[PDB]
Amino acid sequence: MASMERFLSVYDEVQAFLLDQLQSKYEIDPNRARYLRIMMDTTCLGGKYFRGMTVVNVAEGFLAVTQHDEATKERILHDACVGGWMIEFLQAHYLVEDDIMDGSVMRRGKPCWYRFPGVTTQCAINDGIILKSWTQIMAWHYFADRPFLKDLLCLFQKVDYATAVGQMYDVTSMCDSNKLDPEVAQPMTTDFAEFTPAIYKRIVKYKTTFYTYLLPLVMGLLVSEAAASVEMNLVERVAHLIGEYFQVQDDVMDCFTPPEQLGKVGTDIEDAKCSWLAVTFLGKANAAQVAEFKANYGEKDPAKVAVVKRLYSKANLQADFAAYEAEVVREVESLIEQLKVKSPTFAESVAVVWEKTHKRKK
């Protein structure tokens, strides 16, 4: 059975289980069940399923080289699908809440969930909470008897926490750290001294890479009972490397990809985000370019946004991206080679993840 067919079939099964349980144990009525079905579909479906499918693909790689009864193969793949959906539902939680936090308009070509007329922010915040709860409901139901339950739950909650910490790093990335204070309204930085590679790397590591790469790779190992067979320090290092590249691509696309292809209007410049573009620009600009950037960044004024995009264009940041990408290729290939010492099979799964990420539509 093709992996994507299995993954989509398991979504339907998990949805039916969750909704049936709301009826049998939580006293839900049919109209509220329908609302939640629609909310689940709208917030969880429509992406590429990169993260959830990585769990499945990692598991498939081990199945190809390990002796198992057919029923065991089916169990492992079903578990990989459920675990993959846990990650997709965790992402859905963060996207619902982030869109509210940021006042975003569109996501994946459609209005953000909170903007649906019959949702509103009042309901959407709580819908996002439900999405997160569903990750645990599905784990306890499907994995109750499994030897990996404890490790999987502990990993999951640490990754969730890291993501929340990363969201804090991201939301505060345009303020001066020494002025942070709940009592005092926060002005945007004027010096941009905290727009550095190391500070950018911290934001991305926590906000993106743990849930986007580390969690699917390690969950794939756990459902395969294979974690002891790899060097975990290498898994962490390769996840953090590929995850940073993924986010750099997203940062470039926010500025330069036409919104019809992006699925949204990117607002990183208006929001004063510490993006790869801003950090890299400030790492090559002359004093006059720095001053013009300071005079225009972080403002909704469309003429000021256009000045920033022109500064970026004239600064030939495409060349910096090419150099960055070439270095990532060197480093990822090196990490894949190291992974082969203890697990050639897992190394190939990572090679596949990297190729997918590298070839992701620019």
Ligand X SMILES: O=[N+]([O-])c1ccc(O)cc1
Residue-wise burial string across 135-145, b where 16 or more C-beta atoms lie within 10 A, e elsewhere: bebbbeebbee
Cα–chain center distance at 98: 12
Compute the distance between CA of residue 16 and CA of residue 92 in angstroms, rounded to an integer: 18
Among 91, 104, 173, 357, binds ligand X (CB under 6 A): 357
Report 165-204 residues binding a copy of itself (CB under 8 A): 165, 167-169, 171-172, 177-178, 180-186, 202
Residue with tokens 């490397």: 241
Task: Choose from ligand X, a copy of itself, Zn ion, none: what does 51 bind? Cβ within 5-8 Å by kind.
Answer: ligand X
Does residue number 208 form part of the binding site for ligand X (CB under 6 A)?
Answer: no
What is the per-residue binding string for a copy of itself in 21-50, x denoting contact by CB under 8 A?
-x---xxxx-xx-xxx-xx--x--------
From 93-101, 259-267, 300-308, 311-319, give the range in contact with a copy of itself by CB under 8 A.
Answer: 93-101
Compute the distance between CA of residue 154 and CA of residue 139 in angstroms, rounded to an integer: 12
Nearer to a copy of itself, 187 or 344 (CB): 187
Annotated binding-site residue? 250:
yes
Cα–chain center distance at 90: 9
Does residue number 270 form part of the binding site for Zn ion (CB under 5 A)?
Answer: no
Report 111-170 residues binding ligand X (CB under 6 A): none
Task: Choose from ligand X, Zn ion, a copy of itself, none: what does 250 bind? Cβ within 5-8 Å by kind.
Answer: Zn ion
Task: Choose from ligand X, Zn ion, a copy of itself, none: what does 357 bind? Cβ within 5-8 Å by kind.
Answer: ligand X
Residue with tokens 């022109």: 310
DSSP 113: G
Does residue number 127 form part of the binding site for Zn ion (CB under 5 A)?
Answer: no
Query: Is the sign of the CA dihedral 322, 240, 221, 131 positive or negative?
Result: negative
Pair of tokens at residue 308: 């920033």
Does residue number 54 form part of the binding site for ligand X (CB under 6 A)?
Answer: yes
Min dist. Cβ of residue 168 to Zn ion (A): 11
Distances (CA, A) of 309 to 178, 190, 350: 29, 19, 35
For the chain, the straight-line distance linking the first and the last C-alpha, in angstroms and rounded, comes to 30
Among 130, 152, 204, 347, binds a copy of itself (CB under 8 A): 130
Do the beta carbons of residue 89 and residue 136 sit within 8 Å? no
Among 13, 33, 47, 102, binds Zn ion (CB under 5 A): 102
Distances (CA, A) of 258 to 20, 108, 174: 42, 13, 25
Compute the distance between CA of residue 221 and CA of residue 218 in angstroms, rounded to an integer: 5
The residues, ordered by sequence, that sit 6+ positions from 235 with a Cβ below 8 Å of its Cβ are 214, 217, 218, 221, 339
Min dist. Cβ of residue 91 to ligand X (A): 10
Does residue number 117 form part of the binding site for a copy of itself (CB under 8 A)?
Answer: yes
H helices of 257-286, where?
259-262, 276-282
Residues belonging to the binding site are 98, 102, 170, 236, 250, 254, 268
Binding-site residue positions for Mg(2+): 98, 102, 170, 250, 254
| Residues forming the site for ligand X (CB under 6 A) | 50-51, 54, 212-213, 216, 246, 353, 356-357, 360
- Give the residues lining the site for a copy of itself (CB under 8 A): 22, 26-29, 31-32, 34-36, 38-39, 42, 97, 100-102, 116-119, 121-123, 125-127, 129-130, 132-134, 136-137, 140, 150, 153-154, 157-158, 160-162, 164-165, 167-169, 171-172, 177-178, 180-186, 202, 205-206
Residues forming contacts to Zn ion in the complex (CB under 5 A) are 98, 102, 250, 254
